[PDB]
Amino acid sequence: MLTEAQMASTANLMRKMCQPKTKVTDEQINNFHKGVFDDDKKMMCYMNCILETMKIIKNGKLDMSAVEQQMPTLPKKYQESTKKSIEECKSADTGDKCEPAYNFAKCLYLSNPEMYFLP
């Protein structure tokens, strides 16, 4: 099991890698975490980069195997909220190229804004 501090630290390291690769702006990322969804390609490709790095998205598709391995590494306060969100969002990975991860991410946020922890 991971602590919340390790989760925030690993999230920060993923952002440090994925933001320069995609040139998403700080405000675009900040908007996303408040439910303001910019479908600009940079925001979309950032979400693709993040979820590929987490191994949750592979070739534009939700990898339900990676989802199951990593659920036991979640802090228990996120375990229940994540299960419900993945169940609700497991077909939201629609579209082309970076769109599936972005659409999946928007779904995850809207299913439970308070428990959303993606970078």
Side-chain angles (χ1 to χ4, degrees), residues 91-108:
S91 296
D93 55 342
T94 68
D96 179 41
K97 275 129 82 173
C98 298
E99 296 165 353
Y102 171 83
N103 285 328
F104 179 64
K106 297 197 304 185
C107 182
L108 285 182

Side-chain angles (χ1 to χ4, degrees), residues 26-97:
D26 284 0
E27 183 166 29
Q28 280 179 308
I29 292 170
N30 292 341
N31 283 341
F32 200 101
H33 285 83
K34 293 185 160 41
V36 174
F37 301 130
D38 179 6
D39 69 5
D40 176 76
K41 154 165 165 197
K42 305 183 259 69
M43 185 67 253
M44 287 191 325
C45 294
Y46 171 82
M47 287 332 288
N48 186 61
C49 181
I50 287 300
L51 289 158
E52 277 186 356
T53 300
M54 296 168 76
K55 292 173 284 193
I56 296 294
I57 287 291
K58 184 171 52 64
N59 301 113
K61 182 182 195 289
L62 180 57
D63 181 347
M64 286 305 311
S65 303
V67 168
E68 290 164 28
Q69 194 279 352
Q70 299 170 9
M71 284 284 330
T73 58
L74 288 178
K76 57 145 56 68
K77 64 113 96 119
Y78 283 114
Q79 226 120 7
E80 194 151 6
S81 50
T82 290
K83 299 209 216 99
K84 284 226 173 124
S85 291
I86 266 90
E87 287 177 353
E88 165 174 353
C89 295
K90 63 197 309 283
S91 296
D93 55 342
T94 68
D96 179 41
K97 275 129 82 173

